[PDB]
């Protein structure tokens, strides 16, 4: 490994994603294959490319060293194996969705999805999301309200 001069970058970089981010998910990759990463990188791909991460770090000692910053709801995620996912642009989006759909294709556990932060809380798969731009679901709420 590297000394501190390097354990600091994995911090100053990874914590300015939290400081400058959008949504957060969860997942434990016990059996995390590489067809695994391959896929989810195309997903990050659709979800821009390299706007997304997953930098395995669940050393509390790392991606909690980014938490007493923001998201101290994660002192509780960080135990055991974890795969932290941050969003920069994009809706508070679909990121959420396929992690459940992925891991529900066996694709290993999902930490039961211990969940995360947009609010400041816990678990439950939501597509309360990428409807986003479904302001059309407030366009159809126009003419249909005007007519009916």
């Amino acid at each position: 490994m590297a000394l501190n001069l390097q354990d600091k970058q994995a911090i100053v970089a990874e914590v300015s994603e939290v400081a400058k981010g959008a949504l957060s998910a969860v997942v434990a990759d016990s059996r995390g294959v590489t067809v695994d990463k391959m896929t989810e990188l195309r997903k990050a791909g659709r979800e821009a490319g390299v706007y997304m991460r997953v930098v395995r770090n669940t050393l509390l000692r790392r991606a909690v060293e980014g938490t007493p910053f923001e998201c101290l709801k994660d002192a509780f995620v960080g135990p055991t194996l974890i795969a932290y996912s941050m969003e920069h642009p994009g809706a508070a989006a679909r990121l959420f969705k396929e992690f459940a759909k992925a891991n529900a294709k066996f694709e290993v556990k999902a930490a039961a999805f211990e969940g995360e932060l947009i609010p400041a809380s816990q678990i439950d798969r939501l597509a309360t999301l990428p409807t986003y731009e479904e302001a059309i679901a407030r366009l159809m709420a126009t003419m249909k309200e005007a007519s009916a």
């Binding site: 302001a135 407030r138 126009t142």
Partner: peptide, 30 residues
Amino acid sequence: SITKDQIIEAVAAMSVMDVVELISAMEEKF
């Protein structure tokens, strides 16, 4: 209110205008 006076603007408008707006149209009614 005037329905045409709220269609001419309600088909043509910006973006982030809406993004910090229709996370809340859901609130007054629904």
